[PDB]
From a paper:
Subsequently, we used cryo-EM to characterize the structure of ligand-free ALDH1L1 at high resolution. A 3.7-Å map was obtained from a dataset of 86,276 particles when D2 symmetry was imposed. The rigid Ct core and four Int domains were clearly resolved in this structure, while the highly mobile Nt domains were not visible in the symmetrical map. To determine the fraction of free (not occupying substrate entrance tunnels) Int domains, we performed local 3D classification within a mask encompassing each Int domain and calculated the total number of particles that contributed to empty versus occupied classes. This analysis produced estimated average occupancies of 76% and 83% for the Int domain in the ligand-free and NADP+-bound structures, respectively. Curiously, we found that the sulfur atom of the catalytic nucleophile Cys707 in the ALDH active center was positioned closely to the sulfur atom of the 4′-PP, and the cryo-EM density between the two atoms appeared continuous. This suggested that a disulfide bond formed between the two atoms. The resulting 4.4-Å-resolution map was very similar to its symmetrical counterpart, except that weak density for a single Nt domain became visible. This Nt domain appeared to interact with the NADP+-binding sub-domain of one of the Ct domains. Low r.m.s.d. values between the chains of this structure (0.67–0.74 Å) indicated that this interaction did not induce large structural rearrangements in the protein core.
Putative tumor suppressor ALDH1L1, the product of natural fusion of three unrelated genes, regulates folate metabolism by catalyzing NADP+-dependent conversion of 10-formyltetrahydrofolate to tetrahydrofolate and CO2. The protein exists as a homotetramer, with each 902 amino acid-long protomer organized in three distinct functional domains. Remarkably, the tetrameric state of ALDH1L1 is indispensable for catalysis because the intermediate domain transfers formyl between the catalytic domains of different protomers.
Numbering used by the authors:
A (entry chain A), D (entry chain C): 315 to 397, 405 to 902
B (entry chain B): 821 to 902
C (entry chain B): 657 to 738
E (entry chain B): 493 to 574
């Protein structure tokens, strides 16, 4: 319907178009704005002209690009002039939470095929904290369809790189406003300590999105100087284009951080994404999906599917529309992703399969600094860290002194409710994992590892575990070779002034993600930094990654970086246009 | 758009080309063609400096150019504190 | 089958260039005489054995009959032997 | 003073420190937080612990880094628990403006030496719009001192690159909130049309700060592989450090944009800045200085000194504390800056000394698109543009057709009040410039050029000027060689199918900043793009710069880029550390 | 590359006998781009720069970070027949 008042404004808008556009012989209903000949200055000259006619209005440049024709514009202008998410409420940490419990497919929370659900566990109590929607194969195909729709047909692909950045930066500012909320959800869902959750889990998540937002409009290609077919000239250039749809799978140790690390990289490149959050820790990811709507991300860009790894994760590798997987977790599951990637459509793959990270300590070191970093290497985020210090090669001159300091400082470490600020060491995640750590320490003592302290479950409601220490550990033993994935310091002696001998032992490992070395002597430090076969070496520090610093495996730890400039080059592809003239 | 729909309708897509004087067609078609090595008013005009690789089922990981090295290299990340 | 074995071994890197099916659009704006020699030198280059060989040639209907008739003459000229 | 309630909290804060810090035998008044041994996780564990004791508080991580000692912390904590700018009001464009009229030295608006002022002119009316403070040599030295204080001693230098970005991004979001305000001030001060001011003057200013904010924490150096002194090893690396103090001088054609282009680059590199805004257009810069306080930029980072060019600009080149100048304006004044730069302390210099940008048009072109771009090349921002189309080399086959279309479209171009949305062509800046343009056109006719339309002042209150056109223009004439720097289209014939002949004429100019060429034929376009001796070539468009796209002179136009990744490399310096081990 | 340049007529002959590539083309393409390739990548060897990253300083303690571009080790190249 079109009334008299609306017709009066409509003819004034027609009178504008005549004046704005150059030639425009007749402004018909069918006639377009841009086809006629309109620069981007004319879009602002249009909007501001209409804001003189209509007092309030509140019009932006976005809708002009959508509504190009006169019919489309007047229909849109008149529409607005004349013209609910299901949560789980919980009042804890002086904050009424609003955790979504459903899937997220195309900017819309929906149930699974047959409303199939499962319990997500709170490891503080042990009791359940709401049921979560279990994703099925039918739901996966809708998400990948919604992703492919958003990329090809949707708004995400059309808008500028600079625009994608402005959205992704607002996403960080939206996550900053709800940072205390996300930090609380981390503590309930994962069991990460609230103090740490703000600095690490939510903090680096914010930093990550702020970082990669920045990259969006600086992802430069290259004009190559090549053999001119003389006397004919030849221009060559490279465009860095997005791949398409990204099937991210994330681990459980960091719910929100590992999501951001991979997601932010994909979205900055200009990709639609289908995240698969860990079964045992989905609530952070689902809460993140709520924020994408508030930030103003187009619907279909982000897609989240909580469920079983074998069901969801395997379909993404098979589905031919998806052109990129970014798995991170166990080795035996991670290899099975790469196998299915081959027998499908030779899609790209990046892997971060654990890491038995060594940590050498020389007599040159400060000792007092070695202790707190020695703890903060192993005992960091409830021990659950992919770059956790496996073996601690401490020198024989300061083995007895070092261990004796740790035992005192381990007893100080407070254990309890992760919401409370007193707590330093929090409880573990899923219970399935806790029982494995008990057998791990039992197996240590059985094969000949001197349990200095810890190495058993705490008599308490919840899934806690004592900060463990092991001494007198040979290279042939189980705990030396295989990774713990828990708060288990595994100390090893080495002879005084034996640099190559300990490096031989340290590098003797098929897994090698990160490593470290504490020393004052610069000759040792820089030498050991070169020789250590690990992607992320540390010196006089540990767990000192950054969103700008690249990070990845070498050997069985995997390949393909995440964080930094290198991260983008996974989720981008390089076209190579070549002219002749 | 009709021919581009037909041209891109292929799971294999390594290289491609387009001959035309009209710059509006050339640069438009260069963007839309789903192939790692597009040519314009020429063909089989690769170079050792120019990168070259597949997109879809043609594969991944470039050869020739600066990009080629990044396959056969790995990136260590040393970090100090002082 | 190479990428499958790369997974279940030691999680090593892999770069693939699995042939292709390279299109080659030709518009009426083109020169035509240049399109012929490049149209041949796209397909018939190194005994046809090329991973970036012109698969399909999407030639425009305005200059399909003219283009093909030129190629047939030029194909007969192409010397074959030792 | 320290009461009983404050002592109760103080001992609880002491009790925290004992638990937080590792060894800490005694928490004395003198004892430090970080010296003892405290990671960045312990800073968050401190703040959150204090927020349990005190209910409101509102504490952040910033103040913990400042107040390291126990005395400093308790003094700071107690202080806040127990514990005006002079504007010129003007209600225009349905907005009560608040334009500062003073200097800006160290986050503080202050008067000059003896309160020496001058009138800034409104070119719409002609009448004065407040008296602005005239900067003196005594004031300059305070600004450079405040800059040097901020860089070396101040907070700017200490904080991370990522932090500088987060501030600079907020500066853009603050400028976005006051974008309608800045756009209004542009119209009153400069005479730029309000519609254009939002898209260009304020729009690109916002984009610029958002862009360079992004760069801050991605300004990577390089680890060079060098000749190992075998068998001894040799590590080499480069750090990209900031230079120090930047003495920016900006032109008058774009008050706020040209400021942002240079400022944002300096601040992203991590430099303190001493901006010199144009005498005739300071109000935008002074308003920008107000916003730096709201954004949360440390006081002393930005410094702004409106005044005479010979007084202020010459002192910056002499003063040895300043290590960088970025002049942009007239050629004769610009060379005098570079002369003083030599006889001072060999400071770095980047110049954008106008130009004389050609614009070739072939018969292959669309014609209808050539007209609107032909206008939007010359007649853009009241003609006042450094990359204004100087000469238009139009082909003889479509010379008569092209000119006849322009004359019709020139008569359509609305002239009037720049605040009103109807207006397309706004009034010029300072009157001093207007009278020069009248003599320029007089000289054009006197030399022997066919004045088609315009070429004289409009009898109307304000400093308006008619959109001028010139045809039949030889290369020997004055207007062909020297730049107008105004709304004066200077058309020139050339023979049909003469590509090299017109390129010889087009490149025959010592000035060569930008250029253009309209054609469908890709062989001509890409050929002409190579041959044209200009830093910013356009094809089937014009005035299509971007914050990411680099932009600079070649010959007498100057050297040293602004905008893009290249811009930073001016305001940075490259240290080269080399080890041996 | 300079050694392959001296034996370029030899390699071109072997190409013709083994593969069936035409001797004229073998010099320009098969051997020519082989020479160019080695000359190119030889150049790269000592310009494979890493990066010093500006990262969050653990204030007031300083933190230097850098990247080394190291070789992977052993490369199992498999090549086609074309
Ligand atoms: S599986 C990826 C594991 N990531 C990490 O362990 C990184 C977490 N570390 C940080 O956020 C910082 O490096 C902390 C621990 C806060 C130390 O930084 P601070 O000394 O500035
Ligand atoms: S002295 C520096 C002069 N700078 C300019 O002329 C750049 C102003 N141009 C723009 O902001 C855009 O390029 C405009 C004119 C708005 C066209 O962009 P639109 O077609 O997206």
């Amino acid at each position: 319907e079109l009334t008299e008042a609306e017709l009066a404004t409509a003819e004034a808008v027609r009178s504008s178009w005549m004046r704005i556009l150059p030639n425009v012989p007749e402004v018909e209903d069918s006639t377009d704005f841009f086809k006629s000949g309109a620069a981007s200055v004319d879009v602002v000259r249009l909007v501001e002209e209409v804001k003189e006619l209509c007092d309030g209005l509140e019009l932006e440049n976005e809708d002009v690009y959508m509504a190009t024709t006169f019919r489309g514009f007047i229909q849109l202008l008149v529409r607005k002039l004349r013209g609910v998410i299901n949560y789980v409420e919980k009042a804890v940490n002086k904050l009424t939470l609003q955790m979504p419990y459903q899937l997220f497919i195309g900017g819309e929370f929906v149930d699974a095929e047959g409303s199939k659900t499962y319990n997500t566990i709170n490891p503080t109590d042990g009791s359940v904290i709401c049921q979560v929607s279990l994703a099925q194969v039918s739901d996966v195909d809708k998400a990948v369809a919604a992703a492919k729709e958003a990329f090809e047909n949707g708004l995400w692909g059309k808008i500028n790189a600079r625009d994608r950045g402005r959205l992704l930066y607002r996403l960080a500012d939206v996550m900053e406003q709800h940072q205390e909320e996300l930090a609380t959800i981390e503590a309930l869902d994962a069991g990460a300590v609230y103090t740490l959750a703000l600095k690490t889990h939510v903090g680096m998540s914010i930093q990550t999105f702020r970082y990669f937002a920045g990259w969006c409009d600086k992802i430069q290609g290259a004009t190559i100087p090549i053999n001119q077919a003389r006397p004919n000239r030849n221009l060559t250039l490279t465009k860095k284009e997005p791949v398409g749809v990204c099937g991210i799978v994330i681990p459980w140790n960091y719910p929100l951080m590992m999501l951001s690390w991979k997601t932010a990289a994909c979205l900055a490149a200009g990709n639609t994404v289908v995240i698969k959050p860990a079964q045992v820790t989905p609530l952070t990811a689902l809460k993140f999906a709520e924020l994408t709507l508030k930030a103003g991300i187009p619907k279909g860009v982000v897609n989240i599917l909580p469920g079983s790894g074998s069901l969801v994760g395997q379909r993404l590798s098979d589905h031919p529309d998806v052109r990129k997987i970014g798995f991170t977790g166990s080795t035996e599951v991670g290899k099975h992703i790469m196998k299915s990637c081959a027998l499908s459509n030779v899609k790209k793959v990046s892997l971060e399969l654990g890491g038995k990270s060594p940590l050498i300590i020389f007599a040159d070191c400060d000792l007092n600094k070695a202790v707190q970093m020695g703890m903060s290497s192993v005992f960091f985020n409830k021990g659950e860290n992919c770059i956790a210090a496996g073996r601690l090669f401490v020198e024989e001159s300061i083995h007895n002194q070092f261990v004796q300091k740790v035992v005192e400082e381990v007893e100080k470490m407070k254990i309890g409710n992760p919401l409370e600020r007193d707590t330093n060491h929090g409880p573990q995640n899923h219970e399935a994992h806790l029982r494995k750590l008990v057998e791990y320490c039992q197996r240590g003592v059985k094969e000949g590892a001197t349990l200095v302290c810890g190495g058993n479950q705490v008599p308490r409601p919840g899934f806690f575990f004592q900060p463990t220490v092991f001494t007198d550990v040979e290279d042939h033993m189980y705990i030396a070779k295989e990774e713990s994935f828990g708060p288990i310091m595994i100390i090893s002696r080495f002879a005084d002034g034996d640099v190559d001998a300990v490096l031989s032992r340290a590098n003797a490992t098929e897994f090698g993600l990160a490593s470290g070395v504490f020393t004052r002597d610069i000759n040792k430090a820089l030498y050991v930094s070169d020789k250590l076969q690990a992607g992320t070496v540390f010196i006089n520090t540990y767990n000192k990654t950054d969103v700008a610093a690249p990070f990845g495996g070498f050997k069985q730890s995997g390949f393909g970086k995440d964080l930094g400039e290198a991260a983008l080059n996974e989720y981008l592809r390089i076209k190579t246009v070549t002219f002749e003239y």
